[PDB]
Amino acid sequence: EYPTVSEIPVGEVRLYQIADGVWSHIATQSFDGAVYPSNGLIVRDGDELLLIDTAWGAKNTAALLAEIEKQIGLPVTRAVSTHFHDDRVGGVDVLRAAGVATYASPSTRRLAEVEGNEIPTHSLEGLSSSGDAVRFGPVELFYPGAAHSTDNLVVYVPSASVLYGGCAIYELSRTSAGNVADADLAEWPTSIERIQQHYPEAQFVIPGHGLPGGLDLLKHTTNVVKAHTN
Ligand SMILES: CC(C)OCc1[nH]nnc1CCS(=O)(=O)c1ccccc1
Ligand SMILES: [O-]
Ligand SMILES: [Zn+2]
Ligand SMILES: [Zn+2]
């Protein structure tokens, strides 16, 4: 009963319980003539909530905050954007206006600025080299190397064995990349292998768009990427 793209009108946000204190958020948005679902994460951080990624736009992100207040009722105090594109930073200004401290790597912040996208306020240190990991409250942030973008991060919730791949990990049903602007197709498989190496215990893998799966999504994504490359 994970919600699917046809079930969520653009502007609405669903929450899905993955594990105790771990949710995904699911929203929908138009891009390149079609509407796509998009996932982010919500993780309990003591009495606060940590948000991973916006809901792909200001309107959706406002709906996300409203749904969180309705269903969970704890304040979102920090947010991390996992790369610079609009499905991850679009809505940052809404978050800030609501009192959320927004974060991204220096690279993500710079790239968002260059792109004309919203810019998270605070820089995350310790993530500039492939294989780098840092703790951020109840999650670990990991830079696997260039893949979907040069700056992309993935997020692991060690208490729940949940790995959120962002746009670097594809859902199982997805057999094409679509738009590959800003991707590093040549490095992407290598970056995936780094994720596998670091999180071999992951029980739930959440792609950037679409249905949750397991670690099988890693090899699947590599296959799709290579098949584009070929
Ligand atoms: C925000 C935008 C610049 O990036 C969207 C994106 N995120 N990950 N890949 C893509 C581009 C391929 S897509 O065909 O538009 C696609 C989108 C989502 C789900 C499946 C397929
Ligand atoms: O994206
Ligand atoms: Zn992207
Ligand atoms: Zn995406």
From TrEMBL:
Zn(2+) 5 binds at residue 122. The lineage of its organism: Bacteria, Pseudomonadati, Pseudomonadota, Gammaproteobacteria, Pseudomonadales. Zn(2+) 1 binds at residue 47. Its cofactor is Zn(2+). GO terms for biological process: antibiotic catabolic process; response to antibiotic. The keyword Metal-binding applies. InterPro entries: BlaB//VIM/IMP-1 (IPR058199), Metallo-B-lactamas (IPR001279), NDM-1-like (IPR050855), RibonucZ/Hydroxyglut_hydro (IPR036866), VIM-1/2/7 (IPR058044), VIM-1/2_MBL (IPR049721). This is beta-lactamase. The keyword Transport does not apply. The gene is blaVIM-2. It comes from Pseudomonas aeruginosa. Zn(2+) 6 binds at residue 220. It holds the Pfam family Lactamase_B. Zn(2+) 2 binds at residues 83, 85, 87, 148. Class B beta-lactamase which confers resistance to the beta-lactam antibiotics, including penicillins, cephalosporins and carbapenems. Acts via hydrolysis of the beta-lactam ring. Has penicillin-, cephalosporin- and carbapenem-hydrolyzing activities. Zn(2+) 3 binds at residues 87, 167.
